[PDB]
């Protein structure tokens, strides 16, 4: 499931190097000279999170440290790759999210932040949170809880709050907010449940819920819970 | 029409250098020491698309190669400059889009991607597509088809799909999606027609159409076609 | 009020350095080795606005020049820090906006642009305007007029026009447009008044007004004025 | 001749590049961008100088324009470069490829950079010539005043420490090693620097001082301090140098 | 021995690092990233070489893989480095910390960079060895052909201008100063560079030319041009050098 | 005097800058940012050092604070710099503008960088002084231990290869060329480096070894190895040097 995603990635690379020599050595460094996904992702993230304050080479040690202490972060990433390839038809390659998709990079960055937050290294997770915000336009609070098989497609704009929850197999799109409402300190953010699909510009406020296999439509503002397998829409959101 | 836009640009530059000496040599390098627009644009794009993987100097050869094989990309750009200057009143100078406007830079980048896609160099057009996505927050699939006299104003957020079409003299604004809907592989993206104007946060889904001289209002979600010279609005969109 | 914000910032720093040694010398350079906020902000902005065309060290002289000729820009910034800390609960530290929040950085950048615009150095303010647009996804025209105690939370997407006005103690959020409407050259942009709160994706068009203690809801398009202490919503906006 | 070298050299570099790309994948794109995507030496050289001279003050993209202006105005600079490449290939036993100077050797780069600066100097663009001379000094540790007159088929391996003064002459086919100084006594102004004639070999650490001539085909011993003229086809060595 | 040095040195560097971090807050994160976050010298060395050899063509992250591959394949390179560090500490009176070579001294960096290039050269990855040799030349002003054979406990302070040819030998415990040339006469090909035996001290500016031997424990005077063999436990000085 | 030089020099640099900006548009903003936007030499010098010493570990913006702290604490460093500029202008026949040292010459930059490091060294901030010394070595190829005592009106053209040891003294108005070594014999510790008195001219490649004195107004021949004291107003040349 993993080793199988990787094998594919390596294959695509070999063929990609053969037909675009301007990026050959990019493909070779990022993919072809790694043994597994853990390696390629560490390399990729290090470059994506690089700054004057922390160069790639120092970030890589942190990502490797996280992946060593929680190997499942690599499995989650594999599922997030499988996801975007089947769900996005414009994506016709496993390598593509790993190489190029800022939603994917932002997502995996978040997991690093999540691991750091939970260990107690909060100061650094906040630096990383805002790094990803400026680099990739995705502002996920690392205290948030996010599962596997997730897709953030065209991700420019996404925001997700401290107490929020997203569960396996969700698909989000641009400008999607999983926000607060007004006043209620403590818990205050959505609990998006399995297999959901949120559309463009979808604001979704308060400590509510969106149950299984649902559908938020583009433009929607969602103040009221959505039951399993339903479909909400409009401003505010009401079932259709 | 072209030579006339350029002449203006050069003039503005001379006066800009004279009254802001901190940017004089910027103006001199970007504009004043070029003979024509082709040159200035190649320079400008090279810098805008620069990365560790491909520095300005290597990108410039690709843009020059494209402009040599299709000189009309330069004419399109001239019309996209004329456009933004007359349509945006905050823009009081021809040089401004060329120098500073990320919608303009993103647009011209797309044309390079479009030329590469069509020639068969898909691997590189995808790298460029996502480059522009991270650099400028505009995610235009290069297989899309876009015409001349276009304005992308304040462009932070724009997304446009593989099968989409935009035609001469359109004006788009921030957060505008020309997206898909749900399920229908093959053709699935809007055909925006001549002289249209799309407003802020305008989601527009499916393989529909928006005819001539139309008007999408800010916030609109557009599932249903709009006839020529009409005006849609709201969630969903209905004529007013 | 100021000296008190600073004292806090310095304290947080000392403790932050002690528990995250990877950023110690970052904290030390940005904060701990400054005497006051003016200094720390000059340092911070210089780094944030740095480009090949203008490195940090040359930008810092401009920011210092502005802060010398208008010391109140520092007081405004202090109030914008106090603001975000009390209003955002995820923010539990005074240092955080100064260090990390792109809405805050963008805001203070704008003030520099505003000072330059008003002095007559328009060419440079436009360079800075678009710098901030690409760096931080906030596109505030510098001719706009913005007061103190402002918060731009998760700011990815904000746009604000030439003739616009925002007054003390406002809170804006992502994707918020304070835009024009159609045709009316001269004055054409909102006058947001004291203590207002604008929500996610809130488009707000024309030379209208939003009076005191108001509330624009997420997703709202606002064509019609809002009286003091009201609350608007939906597409278009009508009181509730 | 120089113009025939233009093509024999480029031909060879291109071939080398294909084989290099196949055998070293980490550099494949480097070899492609610098060499394989170009159709002549001039285009590769401008590419290479631009990256090598790049700085925050003046980036590659901008330097390339300057370098290409100069090549258009005086394409003998490219033919000289061809001869300089040929010189390194045949004379330095450690260099077995034509590409090596062009890609790697700082002496070769400094040498071609001096050519751009000399062209600028004679066009009256002295402010820029001085900027580039000192850039070259810092980046490659070769210091050549742009008013110096230097010919072709020059080998500057391994160039670290070379200093060449304003009024020095170096003619075709000279080989200079590290730490050569072509300078003044300290006593005069105006014409005060040596005149090195052709085919001269100058050994490491040699200091040649004054407006003195070193005649064709002579050899200067490593470590020498040469204060008097050196006849043609002669070896001078010592501190100060005697004819040996 | 080398393997015991691996640990005695690292132990000391770590201690030094804690004290350095406390006393200089502007560098605290530098010391933390380079030294304190690592558990052995090898891991610190790869970190340090990667940053030092980094370029647009090949960034730190990528070089580290190469360096770590080489260390896995031949960990004696790390033990040599340990000895080289020890050498600098005990021999250069201006160096009072083990960390100083590792952090700062370009001679030490060039030396360990040559080791990576030599390993690559003997694996047949010559294109990359040449890229790195010339990188080292530009960044640190030391030029060592990767086919040279160099041992351990080598001090290259203060290394600017050192040139070492393809067929040179430098054995353990040699001390070389600035502007040393280990080169050819100009007359031969093939085996043509000096053989420096152990414990030899070579003074600044010395040129040692030809396939000649300098015997164990000898001393070469600054400024010397050595053309003839130098017996063990002997001092040679002059231009050309005589046994003094 | 030094303080009068502060103003006569700056006056001239500003004038030069206006004329340079007008005649070379590619550098106009460079000249504006470095020179025209400043009101005194100190402010320009800190600007220039900060860019020149910048690195990933420590960027311009941060170095400028350090440099400005030092200038506030001891403004004689700026007056020395003024004298050093004046020295280059009058003594190097190739330099015809006051701006040239400040903008371009690495010897001048290394020299002022040593001043910052020396100030740090005497304040007990040695970790940072060593970081900067070795930065200076790599960037400008001048190696000056920060404990060295160096005065003013010093010309270090064209500085590549200069090495100056911990216990060396160089007094006012000394002129040093490339590849000068002010070092030890190898035999002693503690006080072991030369004492160069004022107005001394040291020629290229000279090695001056031991705690020996070179007396005021003497001249050291290029290539020399000086092992014995040199009386005032005397010329020493040779390997080893004799009074000539
Ligand atoms: C709502 C959506 C998810 C499909 O849900 P569905 O369960 O198939 O619903 P249907 O398409 O059958 O639509 C049913 C009703 O809801 C309406 N509707 C559909 N999408 C809507 C939206 N975004 N907002 C408001 N109403 C909507 C339809 O017009 C129809 O109304 P009617 O019955 O009164 O005429 C889909 O329309 C959508 O919005 N997808 C978003 C994908 C996206 O974000 N794309 C961006 C491009 S990358
Ligand atoms: C719709 C728009 C394009 C103007 O169209 P128009 O053909 O002139 O329509 P009108 O202004 O006459 O408005 C007609 C009706 O539509 C409504 N309407 C206008 N804009 C609307 C919007 N964005 N959403 C929903 N309804 C809207 C009006 O309130 C009016 O309603 P009523 O007759 O029931 O009272 C304009 O209002 C708009 O939205 N422009 C967007 C520009 C933008 O994106 N600016 C961002 C700043 S950079
Ligand atoms: C509107 C808002 C500001 C609260 O205002 P309020 O004065 O407390 O109004 P209430 O919550 O009492 O809601 C009153 C009515 O307006 C409706 N309403 C609330 N928010 C709305 C929105 N964004 N759009 C449309 N209608 C909305 C409610 O459903 C209710 O309708 P009903 O009475 O017909 O059932 C709040 O709902 C909101 O939108 N906050 C935005 C915060 C944000 O942008 N968060 C992003 C996360 S960082
Ligand atoms: C001078 C040199 C070129 C040889 O020239 P040559 O004409 O072949 O001279 P010969 O070898 O016959 O030597 C002639 C005499 O000069 C002496 N001599 C040779 N080279 C000398 C030098 N560099 N300095 C001083 N004396 C030297 C010899 O000892 C001999 O003296 P003798 O007649 O008293 O025995 C060679 O010795 C040399 O200096 N090569 C420099 C190579 C170099 O700089 N670097 C390559 C390494 S990167
Ligand atoms: C050669 C050297 C190592 C000393 O070796 P030694 O065996 O102790 O020699 P001595 O000092 O006894 O000197 C012996 C003779 O050689 C001469 N001599 C010493 N060093 C010499 C040199 N470098 N060049 C020429 N002659 C030299 C002495 O004048 C003396 O001559 P004499 O017998 O006619 O009086 C030392 O002089 C030297 O050259 N050190 C180099 C240090 C250096 O390069 N740099 C450190 C600064 S970064
Ligand atoms: C030594 C020097 C400064 C001249 O000093 P001077 O007092 O004018 O000496 P003179 O020229 O009268 O020469 C005196 C004797 O010393 C010899 N001599 C001069 N310079 C010498 C040197 N560098 N090495 C060895 N011998 C030298 C002369 O051959 C002469 O010998 P003689 O009496 O047997 O004929 C000059 O020759 C010199 O070395 N200048 C260095 C310039 C430099 O390093 N670089 C500039 C280029 S970047």
Author numbering:
A (entry chain B), B (entry chain B), C (entry chain B): 5 to 244
D (entry chain A), E (entry chain A), F (entry chain A): 1 to 244
Copied sentences from the primary study:
We determined the crystal structure of a complex of StCysE and CoA. Two subunits of the StCysE-CoA complex were in an asymmetric unit: one subunit formed a trimer that was related to a crystallographic three-fold axis, and the other subunit also formed a trimer that was related to the same crystallographic three-fold axis; together they formed a hexamer (B: residues: 1–245). The CoA molecule bound to a hydrophobic crevice located between β-helices at three equidistant active site locations related to a three-fold axis near a cysteine-binding site. The di-phosphate portion of CoA interacted with the side chain of Lys-187 via electrostatic interaction and formed a hydrogen bond to the side chain of Thr-235. The pantothenic group of CoA interacted with the main chain of Thr-185 and Ala-222. The adenine group of CoA was fit in the hydrophobic pocket of the StCysE. There was no electron density in the C-terminal region of StCysE (residues: 245-C-terminus), so the hydrophobic region of StCysE was exposed to the solvent.
